[PDB]
Design a protein around this ligand. Structure first.
Ligand SMILES: [Mg+2]
Ligand SMILES: [Mg+2]
Ligand SMILES: [Mg+2]
Ligand SMILES: [Mg+2]
Ligand SMILES: [Mg+2]
Ligand SMILES: [Mg+2]
Ligand SMILES: [Mg+2]
Ligand SMILES: [Mg+2]
Ligand SMILES: [Mg+2]
Ligand SMILES: [Mg+2]
Ligand SMILES: [Mg+2]
Ligand SMILES: [Mg+2]
Ligand SMILES: [Mg+2]
Ligand SMILES: [Mg+2]
Ligand SMILES: [Mg+2]
Ligand SMILES: [Mg+2]
Ligand SMILES: [Mg+2]
Ligand SMILES: [Mg+2]
Ligand SMILES: [Mg+2]
Lengths: 145, 67, 54, 55, 143, 206, 56, 70, 141, 56, 63
RNA sequence: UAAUUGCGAUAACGAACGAGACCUUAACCUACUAAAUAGUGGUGCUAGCAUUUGCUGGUUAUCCACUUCUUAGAGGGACUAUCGGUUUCAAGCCGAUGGAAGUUUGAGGCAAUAACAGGUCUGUGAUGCCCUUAGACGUUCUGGGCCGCACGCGCGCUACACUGACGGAGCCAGCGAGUCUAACCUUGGCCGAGAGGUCUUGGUAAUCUUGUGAAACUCCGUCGUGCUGGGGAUAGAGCAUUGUAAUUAUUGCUCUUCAACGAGGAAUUCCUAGUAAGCGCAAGUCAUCAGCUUGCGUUGAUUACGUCCCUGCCCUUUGUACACACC
């Protein structure tokens, strides 16, 4: 298309949401490295942040990046549909959350631990390192842990 | 494997023995000839018979052939 | 359910530490074969009996 | 359908069929002939359905 | 020399109608565009984001023009395709129905299509006008 | 060139070579004559064809195979390894693409350079599995001129297909690199390597 | 009523078989050799072919 | 490692300086000289066709082809 | 009435119907001209009946072809056959024999079955394998 | 057994057949079962002609 | 490298226990009137040209 | 020869079943009989663009006329014909030419006597004997289980990508099947991101769903060789759908999670031309559920035209103390 230049102000390896992110790649795919961030959520948000998807995560004035941040923990305020999110309706407060980065591992625990402390057949199934989804365990699951 | 069975060569045999006059070497004449002389219940069979009794003729003119 | 989770001697890392029995890979057993034609019924219908019928 | 009654053997299928042929004819007739042509010219195993209306 | 859209190659066409359908600016993008996937069998949302509704309108149109009538149902069956069930084999899927209905609902408002008898959407008389028009210009771009 | 027109038009450059010389989509079937002895009647070069797609009969009888257009046998042997079974369009276009490339580098005729890499790569004599009176030995035998083109086609395709595997390069490039390196055999090509060693194994056991 | 032509004629031969088997048994002691079904308007005719009609 | 995802202007200086003498230039031959990852290899071949230089005898996705200008 | 013949191409399950009448030199397929055809690699193959005989022959006549049945590549070898047969059907009925047999002579010299339908047919599948010949894999024991 | 099948065939032969074949499988009076082939005249065992000319 | 062009003048038979080899008596084109029997690999008919990488030598029996 | 198919040799001659014939389906009918449930042409009615007539569509039948497409009645065609090679110049085999078609024209259907302690009392209101028969092994109701998971083995499904994934876009089939004592095939329109809901519609069907606008695929781009945007296991949360009932999650969608797998050791299966392989569809099963089957078309090769080496089996010769026949 059109060759660009900028300066040394292109920066590789930027850290955000307590995770290091690769520059020098299309910014849409640099944000998926962050936990809870997939290819759809990185698409919709990068759009909703009014960021050039042709541009790499390298330059990305920090004002832009801080915009990109804000929407990821503020989905319903920037009008991302509410079907677009992983944690909906919760189990307690009843609200809808997109849990991201180190917080997805965090909240993942609680879900299991709930089921575990509840003495649920699926928590039983989880304590035993087994298949929770009801599939046949006979043949599959061999080389295992 | 194109080989005529016995029901084909026995027909062709007994046909030329009594019908050698008429029975020109040309197939299509002999084939049509067969319907008015010999009774055969198949389209193909009649053509298979014909084409062989044809062969008997075409060689016979170069001298006899056994049987 | 209360007993199920807490109980040790239960799990996957549990069973994965033990040894797979030899009868696992025992193959066929063939059952009765090559004895097929020799009649265990041990009757042998009789010359006069088989001519009276057939 | 599988040939064998039970389970065993190499798996032999078989395909039965039944052939249905359907003809229909158009006529213009007075009252006597439709009733005359239909009441007779019956035949076993053949299904004869007749009626007019353009519809 | 006289023209119909059947005189113009498929892709060169639908681009140009989508080029002008942009400069027209009167479409009615439903507002959920750019957030949507177009299919229950597709991986990603369209790579064009803003746009591609100009492309699907320019797709839908030229299809409706070329034949008698086409319903939103048929449009589902058309654009859709093999979906990846992943570990499972690939089965056909219909595309997103609303995306295909809100091209028709908003191509009706723009006068390039009309509710037909026999059900469906028949090409509009002014559609025939506006289509064959950009058709000729497209060959008359290449002069 | 006498540009006649009629209601639905046929383009000029289209119109031109068609009524005229019979060449490829555009390439010269004249010149391009077999650059080795033998190999004749096993290297087709006629009748000329615009593209490498054909209905084809070449199966039902033995040597009808050798009558097929050689470039068509190039794309034919090209579509393979699983997912590429069928799908001749991908191959026919990749060949026009490749011919585009071989012509672009060191000029001449890609279609002749194809034959130049085929006439180079045929093994002259090779070996067979012989039971013997003991540990099996190798009997050097000369190899058919037909087979000489046979194992040459796959030779180049394999190397162009195997090298194009999992590298940024595109098939037509790996097709041309193979064809070019073998046009005058550089031993850097997968095909010319294998040719010599199977002719070496014949001089070996002799 | 209201039958598909397809589904009807299948249910026809089934009606043949069923009736054929009811006659195979009950009339076995008459030497029943098999039936035929002639259908017309009005009735449905059913023709036993036995070897002893007098007992039928 | 090799990167080649950005301009690094002396790379752009290579382009105008280093693409005579090329009997073949494409997407691959761009990455084949130590530079220009594919996503800009097309960008470079579009901008190289802004004027002169490369002469497009080929066509499309996958295969691109060019030579010098005369 | 205008002098009008009709022919058909057949390739695999495809049927390509041809209407060849007298006209201004239009050649269009279905509703669209022969400059599309849209394999675009093989569209040169439906050019073939023309460029074998020379382009002038098509002026005084009109050509339209409409195809149904088959796949993408299936129909092309039908329509190129639907043309060449109409161009020898026109030279059959209206103009004389000697040119019809001048076309038939240079049509089938290079050939590729413009005149003759391709008799190769899909074979039935047999139980025991997914394909016709292909049999399901057996493990012994 | 031997008298029933031999009489039956003679009747089917006297009735003007071109041949007939009486099979009896099973066990009669002796615990191990056997079969028997009782037949006469001429038959074709294969082809379409079986459908027309032989009744089983 | 001396180039030996040998035309196949007759097809003899198929040697080998698996029968892939075809026995052929050939004729070298430079200075005709003399003949040798060689053994081939792939498909062969009469009047095919063959390249011997050595001139005078003969095989006979393969197993 | 595919064949105990023949030629031939000849104490045999001349026949029978099986093979072949036959049958089904697939190839060819500008010839025959026809069709608003199939269409083509012409003619009206009509829209757009060119305005020289023209190009491309819409058109409850508005009528004219037709059968090339199509459909299924009736027939014709191939006989390896013509010719040239070869051979006991015998049956045949071989190439070219002709031809819709020349591998038994391709594919099936049917299939002699004889062998098995092959399988099937869990298909049967086929059945002998034995067991049980009222605290039932009968039948039903409730619920779980056949799916249970340290592992071993088999058919497969999806993958390791650049002949590729992804996004648009072009957009091509056949074999099918479908609603009356109903609740099926369902267009169209409306609401929904999706799954799906709802208001209508035709169809007992060559008439409506359907042209099943299938999928590989072609095409312009986004990535760029990095376990990568290849791969989608695992799992979490949310929405729907079948059904009395879905937890051990029937099924589907949405987002997040992103494992193994970098071409797979010894071995080992299927297959010779529209075949193999790639691709999807329809039917069986079905309330819901296909990674399975039975068919079908779509894309369409590489390599044989041979052989007896492994393997298997058939035939004679031979030997025998077996004949309940090497169990
Ligand atoms: Mg992520
Ligand atoms: Mg599609
Ligand atoms: Mg698409
Ligand atoms: Mg028995
Ligand atoms: Mg028996
Ligand atoms: Mg038979
Ligand atoms: Mg017989
Ligand atoms: Mg057969
Ligand atoms: Mg129960
Ligand atoms: Mg089970
Ligand atoms: Mg259809
Ligand atoms: Mg339909
Ligand atoms: Mg993915
Ligand atoms: Mg094996
Ligand atoms: Mg259903
Ligand atoms: Mg159903
Ligand atoms: Mg289930
Ligand atoms: Mg004894
Ligand atoms: Mg012993």
């Amino acid at each position: 298309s059109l060759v660009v230049q900028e300066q040394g102000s292109f920066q590789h390896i930027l850290r955000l949401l307590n995770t290091n992110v690769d520059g020098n790649i299309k910014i849409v795919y640099a944000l998926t490295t962050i936990k809870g961030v997939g290819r759809r959520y990185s698409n919709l948000v990068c759009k909703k942040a009014d960021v050039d998807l042709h541009k790499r995560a390298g330059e990305l004035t920090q004002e832009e990046l801080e915009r990109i941040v804000q929407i990821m923990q503020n989905p319903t305020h920037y009008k991302i549909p509410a079907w677009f999110l992983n944690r909906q309706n919760d189990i307690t407060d009843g609200k809808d959350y997109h849990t991201l980065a180190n917080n997805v591992e965090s909240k993942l625990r609680d879900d299991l631990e709930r089921l575990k402390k509840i003495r649920a057949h699926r928590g039983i199934r989880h304590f035993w390192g087994l298949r929770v989804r009801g599939q046949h365990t006979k043949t599959t699951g061999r080389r295992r842990a | 494997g194109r080989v005529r069975t016995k029901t084909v060569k026995r027909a062709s045999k007994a046909l030329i023995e009594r019908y050698y006059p008429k029975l020109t070497l040309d197939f299509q004449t002999n084939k049509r000839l067969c319907d008015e002389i010999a009774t055969i219940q198949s389209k193909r069979l009649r053509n298979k018979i014909a084409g062989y009794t044809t062969h008997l003729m075409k060689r016979i003119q170069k001298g006899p052939v056994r049987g | 359910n209360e007993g199920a989770i807490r109980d040790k001697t239960a799990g996957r890392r549990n069973n994965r530490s033990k040894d797979v029995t030899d009868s696992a890979t025992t193959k066929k057993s063939n059952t009765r074969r090559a004895t097929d034609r020799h009649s265990r019924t041990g009757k042998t219908d009789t010359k006069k009996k088989v001519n009276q019928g057939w | 359908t599988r040939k064998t009654p039970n389970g065993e053997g190499s798996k032999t299928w078989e395909t039965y069929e039944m052939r249905i042929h359907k003809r229909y004819i158009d006529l213009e007739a007075p009252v006597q002939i439709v009733k005359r042509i239909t009441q007779i010219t019956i035949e076993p195993g053949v299904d004869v359905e007749v009626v007019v209306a353009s519809n | 020399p006289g023209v119909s859209v059947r005189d113009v190659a498929a892709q060169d066409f639908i681009n140009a109608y989508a080029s002008f359908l942009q400069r027209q600016g009167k479409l009615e993008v439903p507002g959920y565009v750019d957030i949507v996937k177009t299919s229950s069998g597709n991986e990603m949302p369209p790579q064009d984001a803003e746009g591609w509704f100009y492309k699907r309108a320019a797709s839908v149109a030229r299809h409706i023009y070329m034949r008698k009538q086409v319903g939103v149902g048929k449009l589902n069956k058309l654009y859709g395709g093999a979906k990846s069930r992943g570990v499972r084999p690939y089965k056909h899927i219909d595309a997103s129905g609303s995306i295909n209905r809100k091209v028709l609902q908003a191509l009706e408002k723009i006068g390039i299509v009309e509710i037909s008898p026999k059900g469906g959407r028949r090409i509009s008389e002014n559609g025939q006008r506006d289509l064959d028009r950009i058709a000729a210009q497209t060959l008359e771009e290449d002069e | 060139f006498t540009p006649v027109v009629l209601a639905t038009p046929i383009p000029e450059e289209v119109q031109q070579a068609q009524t005229e010389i019979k060449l490829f989509n555009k390439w010269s079937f004249e010149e391009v004559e077999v650059k080795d002895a033998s190999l004749v009647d096993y290297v087709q070069v006629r009748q000329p064809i615009f593209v490498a797609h054909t209905a084809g009969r070449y199966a039902n009888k033995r040597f009808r195979k050798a009558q097929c257009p050689i470039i068509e046998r190039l794309t034919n042997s090209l579509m393979m390894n699983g997912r590429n079974n069928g799908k001749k369009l991908k191959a026919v276009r990749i060949i026009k693409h490749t011919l585009d490339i071989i012509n672009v580098l060191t000029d001449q005729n890609p279609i002749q350079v194809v034959v130049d890499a085929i006439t180079n790569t045929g093994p002259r004599e090779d070996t067979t599995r012989v039971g013997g009176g003991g540990a099996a030995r190798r009997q050097a035998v000369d190899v058919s001129p037909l087979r000489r083109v046979n194992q040459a086609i796959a030779l180049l395709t394999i190397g162009a297909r195997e090298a194009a595997f999992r590298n940024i390069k595109t098939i037509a490039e790996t097709l041309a690199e193979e064809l070019i390196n073998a046009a005058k055999g550089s031993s850097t090509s997968y095909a010319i390597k294998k040719k010599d060693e199977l002719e070496r194994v014949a001089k070996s056991n002799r | 009523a209201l039958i598909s032509k397809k589904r009807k004629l299948v249910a026809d031969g089934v009606f043949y078989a069923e009736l054929n088997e009811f006659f195979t048994r009950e009339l076995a002691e008459e030497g029943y050799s098999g039936v035929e079904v002639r259908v017309t308007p009005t009735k449905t005719e059913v023709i036993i072919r036995a070897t002893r009609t007098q007992d039928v | 490692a090799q990167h080649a995802v950005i301009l690094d202007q002396e790379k752009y200086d290579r382009i105008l300086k280093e693409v005579p003498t090329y009997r073949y230039v494409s997407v691959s031959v761009l990455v084949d000289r130590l530079k220009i990852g594919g996503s800009l290899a097309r960008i470079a071949l579009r901008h190289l066709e802004k004027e002169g230089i490369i002469k497009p005898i080929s066509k499309h996705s996958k295969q691109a082809i060019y030579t010098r200008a005369t | 009435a205008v002098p009008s013949v009709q022919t058909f191409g057949k390739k695999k399950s495809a049927t390509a119907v041809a209407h060849v009448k007298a006209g201004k030199g239009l050649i269009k397929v279905n509703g669209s001209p022969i400059t599309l055809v849209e394999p675009e690699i093989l569209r040169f193959k439906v050019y073939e009946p023309l460029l074998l005989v020379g382009l002038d022959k098509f002026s005084n006549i009109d050509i339209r072809v409409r195809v149904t049945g088959g796949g993408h590549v299936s129909q092309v070898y039908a329509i190129r056959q639907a043309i060449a047969k109409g161009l020898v059907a026109y030279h059959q009925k209206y103009v004389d024999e000697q040119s019809k047999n001048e076309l038939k002579k240079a049509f089938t010299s290079y050939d590729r079955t413009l005149l003759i339908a391709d008799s190769r047919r899909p074979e039935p599948k047999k139980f025991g394998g997914k394909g016709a010949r292909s049999r399901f894999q057996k493990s012994y024991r | 057994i031997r008298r029933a099948a031999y009489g039956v065939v003679r009747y089917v032969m006297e009735s003007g057949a071109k041949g007939c074949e009486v099979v009896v499988s099973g066990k009669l009076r002796a615990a191990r079962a056997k079969a028997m082939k009782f037949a006469d005249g001429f038959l074709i065992h294969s082809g379409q002609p079986v459908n027309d000319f032989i009744d089983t | 490298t001396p180039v030996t062009l040998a035309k196949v003048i007759k097809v003899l038979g198929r040697t080998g226990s698996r029968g892939g080899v075809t026995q052929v008596r050939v004729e070298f084109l430079e200075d005709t009137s003399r003949t040798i029997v060689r053994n081939v690999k792939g498909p062969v008919r009469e009047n095919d040209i063959l390249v011997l990488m050595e001139s005078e030598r003969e095989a006979r029996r393969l197993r």
